[PDB]
Nucleic acid binder design. Sequence first.
DNA 1: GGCCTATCGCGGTATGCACTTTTAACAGTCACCCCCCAACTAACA
DNA 2: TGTTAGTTGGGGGGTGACTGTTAAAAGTGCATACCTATGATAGGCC
Lengths: 192, 288, 1011
Amino acid sequence: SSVLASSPKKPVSSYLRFSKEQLPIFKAQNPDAKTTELIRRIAQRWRELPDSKKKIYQDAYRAEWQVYKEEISRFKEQLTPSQIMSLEKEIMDKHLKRKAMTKKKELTLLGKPKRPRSAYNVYVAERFQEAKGDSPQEKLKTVKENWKNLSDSEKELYIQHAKEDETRYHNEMKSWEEQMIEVGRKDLLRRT
Amino acid sequence: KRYVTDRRLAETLAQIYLGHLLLECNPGPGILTQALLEAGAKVVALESDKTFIPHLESLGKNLDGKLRVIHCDFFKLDPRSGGVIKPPAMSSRGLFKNLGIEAVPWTADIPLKVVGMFPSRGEKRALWKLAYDLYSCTSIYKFGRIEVNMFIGEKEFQKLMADPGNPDLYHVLSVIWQLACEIKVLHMEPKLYLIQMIPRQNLFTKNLTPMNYNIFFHLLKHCFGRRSATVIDHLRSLTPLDARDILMQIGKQEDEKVVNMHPQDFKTLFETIERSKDCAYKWLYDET
Amino acid sequence: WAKILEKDKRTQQMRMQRLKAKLQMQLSGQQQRLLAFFKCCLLTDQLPLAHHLLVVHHGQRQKRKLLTLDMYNAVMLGWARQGAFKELVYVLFMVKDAGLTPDLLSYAAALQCMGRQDQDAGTIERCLEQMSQEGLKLQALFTAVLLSEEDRATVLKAVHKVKPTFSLPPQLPPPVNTSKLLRDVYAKDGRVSYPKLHLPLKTLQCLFEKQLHMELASRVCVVSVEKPTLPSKEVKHARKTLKTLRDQWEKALCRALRETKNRLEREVYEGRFSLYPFLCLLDEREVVRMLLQVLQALPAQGESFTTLARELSARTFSRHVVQRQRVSGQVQALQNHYRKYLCLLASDAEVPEPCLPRQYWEALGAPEALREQPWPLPVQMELGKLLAEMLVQATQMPCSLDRSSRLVPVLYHVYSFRNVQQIGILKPHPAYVQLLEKAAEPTLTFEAVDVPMLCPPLPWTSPHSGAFLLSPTKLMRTVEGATQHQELLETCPPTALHGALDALTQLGNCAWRVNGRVLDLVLQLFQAKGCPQLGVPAPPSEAPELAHCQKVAREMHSLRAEALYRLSLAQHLRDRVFWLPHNMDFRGRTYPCPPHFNHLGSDVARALLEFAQGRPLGPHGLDWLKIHLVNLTGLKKREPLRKRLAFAEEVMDDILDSADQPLTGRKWWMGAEEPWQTLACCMEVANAVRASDPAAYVSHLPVHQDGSCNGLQHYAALGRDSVGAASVNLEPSDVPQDVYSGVAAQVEVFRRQDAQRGMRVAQVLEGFITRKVVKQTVMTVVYGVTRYGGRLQIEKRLRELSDFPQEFVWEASHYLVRQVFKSLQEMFSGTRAIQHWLTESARLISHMGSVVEWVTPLGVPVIQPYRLDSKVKQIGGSITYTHNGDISRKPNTRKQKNGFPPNFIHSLDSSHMMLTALHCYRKGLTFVSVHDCYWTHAADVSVMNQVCREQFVRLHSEPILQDLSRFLVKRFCSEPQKILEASQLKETLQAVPKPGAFDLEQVKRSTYFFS
DNA sequence: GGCCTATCGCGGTATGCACTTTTAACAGTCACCCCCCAACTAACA
DNA sequence: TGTTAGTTGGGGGGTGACTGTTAAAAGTGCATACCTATGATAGGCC
């Protein structure tokens, strides 16, 4: 139920066609080389390729663009109003997902201290490995039960380390947020 | 201007119009007038150019019957906000009084028939003036549902007959005239279209009256000012009422575009807004 | 745990490495926008922002060309003011890389940074010797470059390190005007007796402080003269709701303003221009208060979107100027300077030598603070659209008006299609309108620039310094051609404008006060039942098929509003003394700045005002008060002065009865031509005659002396036309000569011929040719052909003639104008010669693609602004308001040709008025001017007439036509190609009409010349 | 030169043209990121 | 006081980037066209 998936797609251009046909050969002759280097050498091959040879791929691309014109015309004229609305919705939603992924991944690329670890996080980190359970979920529930059965005295070290990580996060937050002020990105500072 | 100079066209027209009193606009050389008289019509010629009057009168003297020739420019009758100071310009009340035409109720049948050709460069002006007169129940339409047959250019014809089916030519005059009259093509002369405009008996309603048509014209001009925008966008600038609620009342969605609205959709919109009961005011109309 | 902590530490260090890697890796509208942005960033001290945008533009191939040396100089001056030597050097690097050439402003910026940073004498010396090798002048820096006193001080500090014996030119010795007609005005040879104010120095300082506070606040709160009755519950509820709604709009507007500033700021972080710094020019609280004020004052019917944008732009610019002077110390220097200036006007203070206010003002200093150039028009338009759209989007209100879940915008823009091209309009919500109507707010708000000043205005020292102490005011009102006329006012020699500046300062220095009794009566009628018969508007209760009733209702509402504002301001100024600063149009005619309340208003307005300083009647004061009374009544227009005085003595009983019981007595005054002015004059005459010594009664009422058809007077003087001089009372006579009666007669014979021919308009105008009709008609054709401002007034005057068929009133007015033109040209053939000469000359001058320019006999350059066809449009998401740039392509030959003669006459009557004022000031007279009327105290009417006639004879005694002809010849007959058009133009200019026999000196003996 | 025609803050909207930025077009591998399990909590509203 | 989301750790699985060029789509600055509506003289065109 996705109109976008059935929409006729643009034909491959000349260079992209040359690469699409050469890549399997270069991969057959260099099975262990990284795709990066194969695409690079294929681009150099294209640059060295005589213009008369590129012209063939260009003509093929032009005919494919004519048939694409016919297909996209009939398709667009064939779409009902509801299909146009669902296509617009899929387009907008896809764009929003792109923005969200780019922004979150960006925020991860920026080197910032991870938020403070709680005493419970510390306990899970110290006792998870030795906690019995067939899966991480069962071992985490086990750690949860043993944590709920812990006394206040058995927790003193974990709470102390939690506080120390609180101060660590505070300081590193000051320094990093300052460094972001230098980069002119005061939006990442704590709000109030 | 435009003048009928072909005898064959004059005869064909004569048979069409004969298909009552006939008012012929700008007969000029009088070929159509002579064709009508030979066909047996009772003709009053409203000639804008006095130079054409003698010959026509002579032709009338040939018949020496009920033909009547008046020096009158039909397209200048009853000037809006005018002092009534011109010989060719006249009052339809006085003209009809001299011709013995009596007013009939709107629901009554067609009392009189007017035929002619739009000015070659005043088609829009004439259509607008006649629209004002029709919706205001003034001028000739004070006497009833006058049938008006006029030659018009192809461009203004297509624009007049356009609708959401042909969005590029859909316009305010299309809405006004398609709501006002049942327009039918009677003949096409290469291109000029002879259009028949008969006012609809059911044009005026309890909420659309000769007293509030101006607000509807304001709504139409306002909406077609930005034809690509959404209807709700314009409604938010026209009434304090809930625009989404109104659009839902007329069965249109929020994303409905102006060019997709049918004339009856416009009319039902206006009547729906006028129908609202519990508000001190329904419209925001305040213009000189 | 050391394992996990150490892992986090290692990841953090690697992240630091990643951070190191990341650190390793011809004017134009757009040019006007960028330059205005850079100059704007200096006032907000946002130098890193402007430098960022400039660097981005420089680094791009296609953008580098858009930059200009002036912009580099702007950023350079910013860094010099901040002392960023490295960044300034970087900017110099950009300048050199872009090629082009550095200038005086660049070297001044470098010197500023070196002085501020205290660079070594080796670097300063090396800079001065590189400047000497480049050929630039050391002294041209302080003179040709616009710098603040701080830039001058720092540059001087830098220069004094290498050249310690470097002195600026000795200043400032001011030069005196040597004009033929101003010579005896500025010459020290003569006994001057300049008048002084009745207020002491400390009083003038208190008033100056009050005016300064008012202008600093930018708002004036006046108590309404309305709201006599009030509902107990309705007004209370509506007031509570309105206050809550205003708090909500205040908060919403603050948030919206901050969000908008943030958006524009990010737009500057991107490579796009935005008005961010302009919004950072004024305090956010001031912006919100301004928007809320505009919302409170928005008319119920709405206001043009473009117009509102313009108003917001002007108030923004004004408040920014006021803030800049506030924070730059200009306010303190103005306080000291003005406090020293007040010695010339104060009664209890003397000056070393007598001089004019402008002369003394320039003598004390005169730093004149600093002049700020306005923003480019595209910036004003875009800013206006920003503030307007922000207000509309931010202001919301519930639709329930009188359980309000739904929210609708308070402001909604709708479209008017009356003009074939639709124009965007901003209309307030009707529920909001009814809310404000029920609230019946008891206070009105005015701009400080719209009300009279509480202290004597600033003397006009230049075309950019005048009127209100802080707010900038243009010397010439004319908006069309403002660039041309302003630039020529600055181009002409400074002395040339001395006369006009001193005249406007004189008019502004006139002390005014309110007539308490007249205000009480006019309010009594207004507060209760209006009196349209006496020019008092009636409340909507008296409004009267439906279309006509609505029309009359709207007109009555408009007049009611105008009277409300005028009378409200009059009530506010009841117990205060105030001054009205004056301005000029492109013709030179003077007009008061405060439009609502001023002496140029209607009869009521003229009666509400009187001189604050009085003058003992003396031997003829009472007689002049009676003659003035009769003149105001209009009953003895044709009678001589002695018979007017005798008539006053006859109706003396009705004068006293009218004064004592205006609304309960015989009400004789209501029958006068000017009822309120007549009543005021009756009160003054009563106080005079009932005083112990009438000759010693200190009279405050101004007396008027008007020139009947002053334009025809000027034409008769130019051509020495004896028939004209007799017609318009230039030739002495014992009875007044009424040109309107003779012209009405000749027009009557023409009307007899045309009516004999069977014409309809001539037949219907039979018996309607009257003095008033032909007075206003001739006053129209002389003062203006076309541009039917006066023509509309004539149409009104005919519409008030009940017995006239209103269908021809338009055609009847046109026919009357044509017949007055023909008749005046028949009986005054010489006048026709002069008029046709000037008209044709202007036709040929404009036909060559050049506007008509001349110089008045007082040295004032006049230029006709009529041009057409300049347009460009912005687009804010989306109305597209157009704009008329100041760049013009072709002149409008028709408006120029029809406009030259009447405009020249305007310059002549304006020059005459100015001479009269200047010479009357030397004798200590109080002089003000309303159109053609000259006003003075009853004690000095004779002296004022003497000065009037002397200055008229002196003015027209010069070869005005000859000097004008030679002027147009030199200015417009110099083009080397083509020479044919210059030969025909010279041929027409040298065809000066020969003057008549009339002896101009006779004006000195004409009693009724001005009466 | 002679004769005919237009005239006494032009309006906002939306369309073609010259330029420049963005992206959809082909693909194999390696690193990521999501989710779950529950709990805790610094931060934001 | 109530809502979010980022850690504590692992394991399985879906998914963007890196290598490359082509050109179709799409965002700027500017000139243009439309919609409609009402008796003398000067300019523009032939």
